[PDB]
Amino acid sequence: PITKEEKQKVIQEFARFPGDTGSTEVQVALLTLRINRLSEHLKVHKKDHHSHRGLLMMVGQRRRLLRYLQREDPERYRALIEKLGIRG
Questions:
Q1: Which cellular component appears as one GO term in the record?
Q2: For the domain bounded by 1-88, which CATH number is listed?
Q3: How far apart are CA 63 and CA 81, in angstroms?
Q4: How far apart are alpha carbons 35 and 61 in whole angstroms?
Q5: 65 contacts: CB under 8 Å, gap ≥ 6
Q6: What gap in Å lies between CA 1 and CA 87, rounded to an integer?
Q7: Cα gap 62→86, rounded to integer Å
């Protein structure tokens, strides 16, 4: 949605391809952004109840991200963990 700042270091760092940004890994990263801008939602809005429009999958997309990636690979559970916001 932004533009030039949509690649300053979003996928280019996560997506290692012109189409590896839609992967599940690059998304888990976008799961963090939608998180920070999720609390500042009603802190500016002023006419659009029914918030949280499916804006929950983002939280569940980290509280158990290992149940998917780490599950289909124990090694993959030790790379984006330091570049997303999993444990420490």
A1: cytosolic small ribosomal subunit
A2: 1.10.287.10
A3: 12
A4: 10
A5: 28, 31, 84, 86
A6: 29
A7: 6
Write down the residue that tokens 């109840």 correspond to: 49
Instruction: Tally Cβ neighbours within 10 Å of residue 7.
Output: 13
Chain length of the chain: 88
Two tokens, residue 39: 């609390």
**Exposed e or buried b for every residue in 51-69, given b needs 16+ CB within 10 A?**
eeeeeeebeebbeebeeeb
Q: Which among 37, 33, 21, 46 has a CA at the least distance from the CA of 84?
A: 33
C-beta atoms surrounding 3 within 10 Å: 6
Helix then strand then coil, in percent of the chain rounded to 5, is 35, 0, 65
Non-local (6+) Cβ contacts of 59 within 8 A are: 31, 35
Question: What are the boundaries of each domain within the chain?
Answer: 1-88
